């Protein structure tokens, strides 16, 4: 008989870098609000 002492099997486990991983970022455009005095289209009429 032989003993597995020296030849024992190996388990594996990755060295995950999640602890130092950057996050996913969401973008939102800062709308030029119409609540603030934004301009409007100058629909014109004629006084005949």
């Amino acid at each position: 008989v032989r003993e597995p002492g020296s030849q024992a099997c190996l388990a594996i486990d990755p060295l995950v870098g999640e602890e130092g991983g950057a996050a996913v970022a969401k973008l939102e455009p800062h709308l030029q609000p119409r609540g603030q005095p934004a301009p409007q289209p100058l629909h014109t009429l004629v006084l005949a």
């Binding site: 996050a23 970022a25 969401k26 800062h30 030029q32 934004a38 289209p41 014109t44 009429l45 005949a48």
Partner: protein, 51 residues
């Protein structure tokens, strides 16, 4: 009149009707656009938010 009466080469422009479009005709003669766009603003500033 009718749409068919307009000579073909004149159909590639604004065709007014009388007296229906008299105000529009006046605007055309004044060379003033009925709608004037608001001045163009600046491109919006993008905000980056993590998830």
């Amino acid at each position: 009149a009718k749409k068919e009466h307009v000579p073909t080469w004149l159909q590639n422009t604004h065709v007014y009707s009388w007296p229906k479009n008299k105000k529009n005709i006046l605007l055309r003669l004044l060379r003033e656009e009925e709608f004037v766009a608001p001045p163009r603003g600046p491109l919006p500033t993008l905000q980056v938010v993590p998830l």
